[PDB]
């Protein structure tokens, strides 16, 4: 257990991760969830996606120096949801306005002409239940695309196609 | 009415099993899981795993005639759990002294001298969790190894020897 | 086979009770009996009994949420023995280390400042005489106190000391 | 700041238990609690209850055999919690499906038709904060009343009306 019903999620122990460091907390009952992705290479099995989650740890602790992977969860088109700063430690994610009030979470790879397959989208979902269910995401927990709060590409076309879906999507 | 951060499950319509015939139901909540291994090849891809459960599904329905995949709910190695015959219909798995009161998971693989990963022991967990929160299973639902319900070596020396850790296992 | 009949015992079946989904069994011959009351309200007629004797079940089977009535056997003040989980099935009223090697026969009422009535003692002491000649008990079992085993007043104040009185009663 | 802050407990040097015996380990935090009452004989005086606390000592450990104090806290109506099997280790109060998942706190007496001194009510919840506040006890624990999970009258009819007024309270 991660107490109550969450959606199978990879420990960090378990994609060989480097030590984190990061010391500042997220205040907890979190409202807004941005959905990104890393513009990386993509995987879909369990061994490669555990060793592309170190691939984007390493750039971000060793390269620019950062204290861990500044997402709070990566999530892999193995079906699985890799770990990151956790539902704790505010991530690095979306910029300062936004980092200490919402969960990052991550699509391994670039989707501006590729679509995530619905074991991720499935995966990430199950993610946002288990959050409510641990106290860690208020039920009324809003879900705005990356680009929706920086100046940025990501999530992709393709990707922020489907996020506008989503129940929790917002304007 | 009541659906708590249940837990993700890959549909049928996307491991593409064939239709089922079944018609027969399970009483709701049911008190026992009855854990057991399907003594083929494992597989951990989500793609292999897509196909170990048709060859299953199959040798079920084409060669033994029966309805259905004979579990309720198959579990790869690739850490992600396979839809069988789900919380709803009765499924053909140990016995008719045990069929009709108890959900059937199932490992899919030999594991007589092999531990199942981390990762599909993560998902089984899972699974019966969503199975409370989604209400088929009672709150005290008791998890029993195969081999306790019906002669056989099933589910597999060391995975037997690992389900009696768990905080559900029954006499 | 020597008609070993003391069958007196009003079956399930009349005193409508609700279906069992115990399926454990005890292994005869059985050892030990312990004796307990249900520190609940007593009844002195088949009527009111087979009435209690449903109470008694639904507090354990629909609160407690258990498999059925804990309890081997009910003895009631109306003289008469009320099968519970029976002679094969293990019950759960002594503990996980007595109910797996016991029967638990328990008195209908609460004996804290009471006795009851003759009826009940033979009754019960006769139920004995039962499970030995079935074979249920070992021709030699050894008589409990609820309390002898638990922490509690149970099988009541006056009705601990009678049975302490018994033959088989065993330190 | 935010310290301990921790109410106070009579050690067990204090009131002279015997050595534990017991190794099983609770896992922390722990999210049930389940209030019994020893239905026994009360006490007011910081040397009634410690001789109090042993004597119950003494009849689960020498009388029934248990390894210690089947509680993990017992609470006097001297205003003061005695400590049980403490914090983290595994007490015998609930049967086998509680025991493991809660901490079993007693309040030395009987409540059947007796009201807990406010001292005790307040020893009680002090030990609460205390139990939150030492990560012992997950944050949104919930109060079980012994006979909401066993069938028994524990705690007593009054000090259960007493508790279903908890804000943990979650029948």
């Given at each position: 257990e991660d107490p109550p019903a969450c959606g199978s999620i990879v420990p960090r122990r378990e994609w060989r991760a480097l030590a984190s460091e990061c010391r500042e907390r997220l205040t907890r009952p979190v409202r807004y969830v941005v959905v990104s992705h890393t513009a990386g290479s993509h995987c879909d099995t369990p061994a490669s996606c555990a060793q592309q989650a170190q691939n984007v740890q390493s750039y971000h602790v060793?390269?620019?120096?950062?204290?861990?992977?500044?997402?709070?969860f990566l999530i892999g088109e193995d079906g699985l949801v890799y770990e990151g700063r956790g539902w704790n430690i505010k991530g690095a994610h979306a910029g300062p306005t936004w980092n200490p009030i919402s969960i990052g979470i991550s699509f391994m790879g670039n989707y501006m002409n590729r679509v995530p397959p619905p074991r991720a989208l499935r995966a990430a979902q199950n993610l946002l239940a288990c959050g409510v269910a641990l106290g860690a995401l208020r039920s009324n927990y809003e879900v705005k695309g990356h680009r929706d709060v920086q100046p940025?590409?990501?999530?992709?076309d393709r990707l922020y196609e489907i996020i506008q879906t989503w129940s929790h999507y917002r304007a």
């Open positions: 060793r390269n620019l120096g950062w204290c861990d992977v500044g997402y709070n940025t590409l990501s999530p992709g």
